[PDB]
């Protein structure tokens, strides 16, 4: 579920599933942040975990 | 959708819907943080927005 284009609630859902009890931060307006890395291009577990606490 | 018990993906979904493009942080292990305020007791828009960026 992580190795695809993930946007909006689909992206937030992946962060929830990956980060578990650590939680995460979702900052879609951050330049070259998660939207560019996971929504406009293909996401990865490696990148998603950059956003777990 | 905000004025009820909200846990797990249901809570993350509400933060997504409320915070919009500001994004948010989801920190479930924070003592007296969002889990106590929105999951084990009834959530509110006022409290959810404390977690928007």
Q: What was the experiment behind these coordinates? A: X-ray
Domain span holding position B21: 9-49
Instruction: Tell me whether residue B1 is in a domain.
Output: no
Q: Which two tokens stand for residue A26?
A: 């979702």
Q: In Å, how far is B48's CA from the nearest CA of chain A?
A: 14
What resolution, expressed in A, was reported for this entry?
2.1
| Residue keyed to tokens 């942040």 | A33
Instruction: Tell me whether residue B4 is in a domain.
Output: no
Query: What does the buried/exposed string (b/e) look like for A16-40 if buried means 16 or more CB atoms within 10 Å of the residue's CB?
Result: bebbeeebbbbbbeeeebbbebbbe
Yes or no, beta carbons of B26 and A24 under 8 Å apart:
yes
Task: Using CA coordinates, name the residue in chain B closest to A34.
Answer: B23
Instruction: Tell me whether residue A1 is in a domain.
Output: no
**Domain tally, chain B:** 1
Q: Which site among B26, B35, B39, B52 would you substitute to test the A interface, given the most A Cβ atoms closer than 10 Å to its Cβ?
A: B26
Q: Which of A51, A26, A33, A52 is nearest to B52 (CA)?
A: A26
**Which residues lie below 8 Å from residue A26, measured CB to CB, with a gap of 6+?**
A11, A12, A15, A34, A51, B15, B16, B23, B24, B25, B26
Instruction: Tell me whether residue B43 is in a domain.
Output: yes
Yes or no, beta carbons of B27 and A23 under 8 Å apart:
yes
Q: What angle (nearest 5°) sits at the alpha carbon of residue B5, between those of residues B1 and B7?
A: 100
């Amino acid at each position: 579920f992580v190795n695809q284009h993930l946007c909006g609630s689909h992206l937030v859902e992946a962060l929830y599933l990956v980060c578990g009890e650590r939680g995460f931060f979702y900052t879609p307006k951050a330049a070259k942040g998660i939207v560019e890395q996971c929504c406009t291009s293909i996401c990865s577990l490696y990148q998603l975990e950059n956003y777990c606490n």
